[PDB]
């Protein structure tokens, strides 16, 4: 199968500024019929993939002129003259010259915005999870940027790395921020053998770590 | 215009066969075009699987040929994907699409998990806090397979909501969702987490009660 390679895998762009993606194929995409069936596809968070470009440079219906495709043979480019927030998502180049049709490795476009500190919130095990004999401690880190962040769980001052489930939302096109969930799963009995539960986040927006903490013997 | 809508079993046992339906609305699949199945693996890789054209002619990705078939029912305006000898590696989001013949429009996709693990309903826990804003949470734990649907106040609360992708831990999924409102909105105005797990026919409504 024809291999499609994209560069870069990641793109961070300011609104109103140009963005571009390179695509390369393992062999020429120029068909015997004289045409080059190179396509571009956009997948926004929470939406179906959507056609942007076909035949290297032809615009699909509803696609703004801001999008521009070019290239030939094995080398192709997608250019967005003026980036808007709705442009964030994952971008795929793919070829339809050769059978089977094949897709390239995606490029993720993120909207570069001003730095924003995380809203950090800690949650002791719910009175419902505890009664049922369970104990999960949860830390939300909401609406921050950039994505770079350090989050540590400390139980009785001791850093925990086992049983820590971290999950990230896609960048929110409404505020260009990220949010992350951190969950430490214990048992009812282990939770009861410790006192202090601390979520500590390090982010460039603050010189001191953002710390949320609770003590069992105070709830 | 044309609407595409995928449907089928969300969980199939290894070695058995996968069966998916794409229901088309607004246009007869017999009129024109090629009707494709494409799948997206965890990690977002896309693979074209094959198509059936308006005449009923099929074409399959050579990597799957001995294992795949695409058929149709012109009376129902549907076409179908059939994938045999499935393994966990066949776990993916399956999309139907159409083009002339290169795909031009895509469906919403449907998740298909291939595994021997058993269906398990989720436990749903309300996360109440211990600033100007206040964050509430919902913890959906120990379910299988994906997906669940989660809403706040039966969907009437959508702003300030962050629903995090499920993480698979020990053949069980955990998912969480947060909602942020003004500090003087809750608990004066009640907030409830609604979780549906179609696989187990589960539907839970858990109100976020403030802690003592």
């Amino acid at each position: 199968d024809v291999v499609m390679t994209q560069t870069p895998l990641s793109l961070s762009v300011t609104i109103g500024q140009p963005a571009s993606i390179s695509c390369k194929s393992s062999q020429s995409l120029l068909d015997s019929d004289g045409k080059t069936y190179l396509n571009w596809l956009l997948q926004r968070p929470g939406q179906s993939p959507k056609r942007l470009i076909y035949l290297v440079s032809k615009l699909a219906s509803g696609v703004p002129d801001r999008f521009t495709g070019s290239g030939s043979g094995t080398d192709f480019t997608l250019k967005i003259s003026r980036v808007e927030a709705e442009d964030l998502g994952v971008y795929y180049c793919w070829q339809g010259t050769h059978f089977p049709w094949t897709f390239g490795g995606y490029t993720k476009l993120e909207i570069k915005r001003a730095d924003a500190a995380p809203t950090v919130s800690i949650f002791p095990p719910s009175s419902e999870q505890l009664t049922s004999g369970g104990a999960s401690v949860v830390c939300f880190l909401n609406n921050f940027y950039p994505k770079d962040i350090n989050v540590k769980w400390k139980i009785d001052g001791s850093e925990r790395q086992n049983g820590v489930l971290n999950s990230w939302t896609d960048q929110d096109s409404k505020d260009s921020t990220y949010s992350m969930s951190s969950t430490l799963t214990l048992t009812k009995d282990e939770y009861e053998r410790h006192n202090s539960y601390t979520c500590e986040a390090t982010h460039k927006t603050s010189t001191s770590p953002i710390v949320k903490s609770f003590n069992r013997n105070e709830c | 215009d044309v609407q595409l809508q995928e449907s089928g079993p969300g969980l199939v046992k290894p070695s058995q066969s996968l069966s998916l339906t794409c229901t088309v609305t607004g246009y007869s699949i017999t009129s024109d075009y090629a009707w494709s199945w494409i799948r997206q693996f965890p990690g977002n890789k896309l693979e074209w699987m094959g198509y059936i054209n308006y005449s009923g002619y099929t074409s399959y990705n050579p990597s799957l040929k001995s294992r795949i078939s695409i058929t149709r029912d012109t009376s129902e305006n549907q076409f179908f994907l059939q994938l045999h000898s499935v393994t966990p590696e066949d776990t993916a989001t399956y999309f139907c699409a159409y083009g002339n013949y290169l795909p031009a429009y895509w469906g919403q996709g449907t998740l298909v998990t291939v595994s021997a693990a058993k269906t398990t309903a989720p436990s749903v826990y309300p996360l109440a806090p211990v600033g100007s804003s206040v964050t509430l949470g919902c913890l959906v734990k120990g379910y299988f397979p994906e997906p669940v649907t989660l809403t706040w106040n039966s969907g009437s609360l959508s702003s300030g909501v962050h629903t995090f992708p499920a993480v698979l831990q020990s053949d069980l999924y955990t998912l969480s969702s947060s909602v942020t409102v003004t500090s003087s909105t809750w608990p004066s105005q009640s907030i409830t987490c609604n979780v549906a797990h179609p696989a187990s026919s589960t539907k839970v409504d858990k109100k976020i009660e403030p802690r003592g």
Binding site: D31, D33, G96 | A34, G99, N100, Y101, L102, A104
Partner: peptide, 7 residues
């Protein structure tokens, strides 16, 4: 939709 080589 415009016709491509496969159509």
């Amino acid at each position: 939709l415009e016709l491509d080589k496969w159509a």
